[PDB]
Paper text:
During its cytoplasmic replication, vaccinia virus assembles non-infectious spherical immature virions (IV) coated by a viral D13 lattice. The characteristic dimensions and shape of the crescents are determined and maintained by the D13 scaffolding viral protein, which forms trimers that assemble into a hexameric lattice coating the outer surface of these membranes. In vitro structural analysis of recombinant D13 reveals it has a double-jelly-roll structure composed of 8 antiparallel β-strands that self assembles into a honeycomb lattice of pseudohexagonal trimers. During this maturation process, the D13 honeycomb lattice is lost, and a biconcave viral core, containing the viral genome, assembles inside the IV.
Given the clear lattices present on the IV surface in our tomograms, we analysed the structure of the D13 lattice in situ by STA. We obtained maps by averaging surface sectors revealing hexamers of trimer arrangements with a lattice spacing of 133 Å, in agreement with lattices described for in vitro assembled D13 and deep-etch EM honeycombs. We found that the D13 lattices coating IV have a similar architecture to the D13 lattices formed in vitro. From the hexagonal packing of D13 in the subtomogram average, we estimate that approximately 5,300 D13 trimers will cover the surface of a spherical IV. The packing density and radius of the D13 lattice on IV are compatible with an icosahedrally symmetric architecture with a triangulation number (T) in the neighbourhood of 268. We have not confirmed the presence of icosahedral symmetry, which would require pentameric arrangements of D13 trimers, such as those that have been identified in vitro. Finally, we observed a gap of approximately 5.6 nm between the innermost surface of the D13 lattice and the membrane of the IV. This gap cannot be explained by any unresolved N- or C-terminal residues of D13 and must therefore be bridged by another protein such as A17. Analysis of tomograms in 3D, however, reveals that a proportion of IV despite being closed and fully coated by D13 have a single invagination of the viral membrane. This suggests that the D13 lattice is flexible and can accommodate both positive and negative curvatures present on virions with invaginations. Furthermore, Hyun and colleagues produced D13 spherical IV-like particles with a similar diameter to the D13-coated IV we imaged in situ. This strongly suggests that the D13 lattice, which initially curves open membranes and eventually forms closed particles, determines both the size and shape of the IV.
Numbering used by the authors:
A (entry chain A), B (entry chain C), C (entry chain B): 16 to 45, 49 to 547
The structure:
Amino acid sequence: IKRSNVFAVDSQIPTLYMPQYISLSGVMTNDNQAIASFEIRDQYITALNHLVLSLELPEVKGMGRFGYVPYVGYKCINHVSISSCNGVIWEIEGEELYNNCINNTIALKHSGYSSELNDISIGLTPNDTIKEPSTVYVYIKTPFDVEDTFSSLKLSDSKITVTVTFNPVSDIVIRDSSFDFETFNKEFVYVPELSFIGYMVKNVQIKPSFIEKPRRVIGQINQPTATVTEVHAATSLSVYTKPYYGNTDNKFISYPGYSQDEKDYIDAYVSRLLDDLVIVSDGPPTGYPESAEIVEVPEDGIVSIQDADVYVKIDNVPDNMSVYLHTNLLMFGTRKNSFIYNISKKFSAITGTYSDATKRTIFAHISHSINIIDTSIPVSLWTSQRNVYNGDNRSAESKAKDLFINDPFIKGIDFKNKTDIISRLEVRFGNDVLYSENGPISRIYNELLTKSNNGTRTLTFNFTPKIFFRPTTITANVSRGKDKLSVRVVYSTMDVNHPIYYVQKQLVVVCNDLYKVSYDQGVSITKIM
Amino acid sequence: IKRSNVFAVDSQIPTLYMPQYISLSGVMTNDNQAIASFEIRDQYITALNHLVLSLELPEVKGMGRFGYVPYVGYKCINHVSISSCNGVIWEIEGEELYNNCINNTIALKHSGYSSELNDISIGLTPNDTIKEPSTVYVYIKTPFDVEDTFSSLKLSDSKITVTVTFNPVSDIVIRDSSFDFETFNKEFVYVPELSFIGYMVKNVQIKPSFIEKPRRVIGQINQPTATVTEVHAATSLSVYTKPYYGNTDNKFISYPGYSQDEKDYIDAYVSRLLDDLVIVSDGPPTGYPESAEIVEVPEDGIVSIQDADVYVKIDNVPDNMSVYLHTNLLMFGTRKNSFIYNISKKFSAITGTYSDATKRTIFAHISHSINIIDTSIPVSLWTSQRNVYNGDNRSAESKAKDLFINDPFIKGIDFKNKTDIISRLEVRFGNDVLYSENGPISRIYNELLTKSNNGTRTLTFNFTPKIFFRPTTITANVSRGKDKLSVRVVYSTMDVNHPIYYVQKQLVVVCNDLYKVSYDQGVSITKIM
Amino acid sequence: IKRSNVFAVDSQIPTLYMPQYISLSGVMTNDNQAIASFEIRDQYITALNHLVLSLELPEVKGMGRFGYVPYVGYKCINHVSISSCNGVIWEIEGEELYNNCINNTIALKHSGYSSELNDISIGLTPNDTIKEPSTVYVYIKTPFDVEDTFSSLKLSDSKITVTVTFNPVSDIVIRDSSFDFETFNKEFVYVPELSFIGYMVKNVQIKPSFIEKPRRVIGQINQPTATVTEVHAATSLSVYTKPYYGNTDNKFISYPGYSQDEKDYIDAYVSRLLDDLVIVSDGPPTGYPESAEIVEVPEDGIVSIQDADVYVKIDNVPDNMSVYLHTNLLMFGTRKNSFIYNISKKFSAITGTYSDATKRTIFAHISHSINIIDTSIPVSLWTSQRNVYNGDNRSAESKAKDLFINDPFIKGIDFKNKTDIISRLEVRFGNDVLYSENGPISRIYNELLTKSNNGTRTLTFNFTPKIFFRPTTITANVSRGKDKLSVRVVYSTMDVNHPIYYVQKQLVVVCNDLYKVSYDQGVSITKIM
C-alpha cells in the first residue's frame, strides 16, 4: 500500500517577485460626463491586480435635507475600461460591477455605507454643514483577482490605461426641494485616485489565459423581450428587470437612510404617513385639500372606511380638542365607481399619546398592512391623468418633505427587489428552447451556488475550476443558426387600480463571453469563436 | 534554482459537458404519511447533484392565531432516500439533513424564514386570510455536492428514484386553540417539485468513489445510554439529546415568532406574563382562581414575596383604582412546606404608565431574572400531579392564548439548546474507552472546525481532504470485539422543585459509515468492512 | 484533444493515522504574574495542532457594579510560548494572538461574549451574586493550523512545553468604586486547562517546513517613530497605535457592556449625561458644584449657550416645579477667554416626560452631536491641570457611577479604533524608502485581502499559497545596510482645546519573520538569513 503523505509537503520555490502598493492620480475630462484616465507605464511592473478607486467627497453646506445613497462609491461609477495599445482588454458597466461585488460585505462597507454618509441630514442655515468631507474606496473586482498572482494581468512591456466614467452627481444624492441642488451640481467635481498591487517579477514565464467579459443588453420600455447577438462562447447568462422612472419627477414620500431592511423602509413610510393620518385638533383640521375626508373618531374609537374599521385611541387629548382620522390620505382608481386603492384602509389600530408641550401625537403601537411596494410608489403616480381621484390629500408641510431619489442600480419594481414580476422565463439558443421555467428556481440556484443573498435569474454553463481549466461554455452552431440568445418573459399581472401597475419596466440581459488573452506583441484579447 | 511558476498556468481542457436545470413533478401517496416519488430516467443525463425541493404552501383562512415554524421547508421533511435498481444509494433523516444544513444561512433563508411566514398571525373572521400562498425551497445537501462535478452522482444507464417522506402538518404549525386545526389538517396536502442540476457528458470516464451515510440511533426515554452496532468504518460520531414532550399537550405560554434570539424568547415570555402580573383595578381584581394571591402595592411601591422584594411603580393611575401585584402567578413545588418555584419572585422592578383610553398598563422598564428555560417549560408541567400547588393562576384570557408547538428538531431542554444537560460523556469502541470528557470540549472543536454556531458533541476521525483521498475512519477489530460504539452520559443534576426537571429526554447518537460506490452494472454501494 | 477528467478522481490512500482530543491540566506559578505550564510527552503522539485553552471563571459575590470585558478569554492572555528541548519553537503576545483571531467570530464568541458575562451587573448586598461561575475557551491559533495535518507540529520524540502567561485580573474586569476589588484580586486565581488534537501516525515521513513568527516593537510614549532591527526575511509588516492611559486613573463615564456598536457606545454615554443635563426640580437644583450654570428653560423651550440653542420640552411637569438645563456639564479649555469644549452645546433637542411616581424624567427623542471620541475621554482629562475651568460639574451621584476600564487591546484613541490619527506613514528598508502613503490605502488592502473588518495598516510581501510554497519575503542586503525596518508617521492634528489631544500614544510595529523548521535531533527552528 503506497500511501500519500498527508503530514508533510515538498515546498516549491516560487518565482522571485516583490509586491508593491501603487497609487496614481488621474486626468479628468468632461452633458459633460466626467472621465478619469490613469496611465500605467513602468518597466519594472510586470503584473498587477486588485484595483481600488479612491474618491474624496467634499463638504456639503447649506439648507435642506441631503444624503448619499448607500454604496455611493459604487453608484457613482458608470463604466470602467482597461486598455492597452491593441485595444480594450476588459471593461464593465457600473451596474454589473456592483452586481459582481454585491456579496463582498467588506467592499460594500468601504465604498460608503454608514450613518454619517447615508442618514438624511438637515441643514438649518446657509452656513450649516450637512456633511463633512470624507473618502470612499471602490474595489473594482476584475477577472485578474480570482487566483492572486496566477490570474494577474501581465504588462508585456505595454502601457496600460484605466478609464473611469462617472455618473452625474444627481444619481448619488438623496435630497428634498429645499436643498440648492443647482449650485451643488455646478460646484461638485469628482476627485479620483487609482490604486493597485504591482508585482516586480524576475524572469517571468508567461502563458496565454482566458477571460470572461460581461456584455449587457437592455430591452425597450415595457417590452417582454431582449436578445443578445453574436454569442459563440458564453459561460453564463443572467436576466433581471429595472424600473424606468423617466415618466416621473423621481420624488418619493420617504427613504429610510442608513437602515436598509424592508422593515426599515416600511417604518419610515408609516412614520411619514402618521402625521397627516391622525390629527388632534380644535375643530375640523385645516390646511388639507378639499378632496380630503377628515372624520371625528367616536367614543368607541372605531372609524369605518367602506368595509374597513380603523381603531384609533390617543391618550391625553385636551378637553377642547378631538381626534380626527384621514380616511383618504392617498387614493387611486381608474374607474369612477369601482375599486379604489386607499392608503388609509391599510391601517387597523393606531394608539399613541398627545404631548401638550410639543403639540404633537407620539405614536406607540401601530397595526397596519403596508408593504414594500407602497414605500416604492413614486409621488407622480398618485396624481397621474389615469387617476380619477385627487390622489394626494396630504398637507403642504408633508408634501414639502418628499425626496428626490435617482439611484441607478434599482432592480424590480421596489427598492428591495423583493417582488418578482417575472412569472415565466424562456431562453432560446437560435430557434430551439434552451431553458424554460415558471418559478424562480434559477435564482434559487444562483444564490445557492454563489453564496449570495441578492441573486438574479441566471443560467450558468460553467462548473469547472476557474483558471486552472479552460471554462466550459455553451458553444455556437452558426450552421444551425445557434448564434444568438433570445429571452422572452411573462410579467406578473398586477391590479389595474394599483399605482404600481404603471411603473415602467425594462428587461436586462447580461452575457459573459469567453476571450483568449495572448501576450505576443503586448497584451491582446480575441473573442473565442 | 528551479522555480515553480506562480504567475501562469497551463490550462487543462476539461471533459466536454453541458449543464441543465431540470424540474420534476412527483407521485404522491399516503396515519397516512405523505410520500413523494420522483423518477429520473434520461439517457442523456450522465450525472447530477444539487437537489432542491419545492413546496407550495396554500392560503390559510379562518379565525385564530396561526404561524409556521422557522425553516418550515426543512421541518416538514421526515426522510429522503435516493435509490437505483440495486437498492438504496444514500438516505438521511430530516433531523440530520437540517443538521448538515444548519450552517448554510442562504439555504435556511430559502426554506422559509421571514416575518410573513413565521409571525403568529391573527384571523378575526372565518373568511379572514391569515397567510397567503407561498413557495419554499429546501436544498437537500448530498455528498455529491462537495466538489461539484468531481463528486456528482453518475447514472450508469440506470433509473434513479428520489423518495421524500413528509412529517404531519402539525409539526410545522404553531397555533392556538381558536384555530380550526382539524379542518386545516383534513385539507392540507403537500405539493412538491424536485429540481437538480444534470450534466450531459461526452465520453465520461467513471471511477469508483467513497460516500459517507449517516446512521441514527435514539435511546429509550430518560436512559443515559445508546449504542450503535455493526461499526466497521466510521468517519465521525455525534451525540446530543432531544426533549420528549409526549407526556404533555405540547402547549407553551409564548413563542417569539420570527425573532429567534434568546433575548427575543425571553421578551415574548415576559410580555405574556405582565398582563396578569400587574393589574390596575377598582378593588381586588376579579377573574382569577382562588389560589391566586393578589396584593395591593403600598405607597413605597415595594411588595415582599418571601425574601423577594418587587418594586412596582405605575404612572397615571386613576383616583378610584389601585395597583395590584400577582405574587404567585406560576408556582411549583413537590413538598408542601419546602422550596417553591415562583415566577413572580423573578421580577425586581416593574414600571409603566396606565392608559385611560385603552384601559391597559403600557410597561416601560422591567428588571427580571427570567431565562430561556422558563420560556421552554410546557404548560402541562405547571399542573402535573407532582405539583402540590395549583400551578397556573393566570386569567382565563391569558390561558386562551397558549400555543401548540410540535417542532421536531428541538435539541436539549430549551428552544435554543442553550443549557447543556450532559455533564460527562464516555464513548467505548468495543469494551475499551475511546473517549472521555466532562466539559463540552468536543462541541467547541466541532464548532471551530466546521465554522458553525450550533455544533454538537462530535468525535471526528477524518481530517483528510474530502474526495481526493479515501477518508480516514476508525476501523473495527471484530477479533477483539471492537465492532460497536457505546455511549454513556451523566446528565446535569437539576433541582427537584424546578418544573424542567420533569421534561423527558432521549439520547441521540449519529454515526457516519463509509461506503464504496461502484458503477459496474448500474450504481451500487457496498459497506466498507 | 486529451481532456482532463473533471467527473472522477483517483483517490489517494493517505497516511494511516488516528486523531484524538487530549486535555491537560497545568502547573501554576506566580507583582507575581500567573504562569501555567503544560507538558506534552507521549511516544504515540506524532503531531498536534488546534490548541484551546479552558478557563474557569469563579462566582463573583458582593456589592457594586461588575462586568467582564468582551472576549475576556483572549484579554487575560499576556504571552504564549511553545518550546522543546532545543528552545522556543513559536511564541506570540496576547495582543497579536487576538489580532490574528479578530476575524474568527466563532472563536471570539467562545472566548466569552454574552450578556451574562459582559453586562455590568449590580450587587446590592454583600451576599448577592453578581456573576455565576462560567467557562470560556480560547482558541490559540498557531501556524500549525492552516493546512490541517500538512502543517501540524511534529514531535520528533521530543517533549513539548506550552507556557501561558496571564494578565492581571484588573485587565479583564470593568468595575465601579463600590466593588471591593482589593478582596476580589486577593482571591482570584486562573484555573487553566489545555486541549489539542493529537495524531497517532503510522510510519510518518517528515520533511522540513517554514514558519512565520510575529515580532513586536512598541515605540516610546508620543514618539512618531519605531524601528525593528535584524530583519532578514519578513513576510509582512503592520503598524498601529495604542493609547497610553498611565497618566490617568483609567476611569470613564460609561461603558455599553455587551452592546459593542459605535451607536451603542454613544447611547450609553448620552444616557449617563441626561440625568444631570435636564433637571425637573422645585427651585434651583441643589447638589451641584459652584461652577455649575443651571438655567431655567423659558416658555419657548429654547436655551442659548453662546451661539448654541438647546430645545428642551418635558411633558407632565408639576405646577410647583420647573425644567432646568445644565449649560456647562463638562467643560474644557486651555486659555481663559478663548474656545471652550462644552458637552452641553452638543445637544440640540431634548424631549421627554416627567414621571410623578418615580420622580424622574423619562427621555424620548434626543438630537445631539456626540461621537465616539467623547465616550472615549478619560475622566481624569476633564480635570487636568491644563484645564483652566472646573471640568466636571456633574452631581456626586453620577460621579460615583464612573467605571474603571483597563482593557489591554485598545487601538487608536477611542474604544472602536474609528478615528485614524495617522495622517502619513513612511517605511524604510535600510535608508531607502520602501513605502509611503497619506491615506489608509494599506489598511483598505489588508481588510480586502484578509476579509476582515478590523484591519490595520499592513505591508504584505507574500502572495503565494501558504504551506505548499516557500513564502515570499522582503530580503535583507546587509552589504547595502538593508537589514532594519524603520517606521515614521505624522499624527493627525487635533484641537488644543479638545481633551482627546492629551491622550498619550504609542506606535506599535509588528514584523513576521520567516523561520525554517527542521526535525533532526528533535524539533528546532532557525532564523532565515
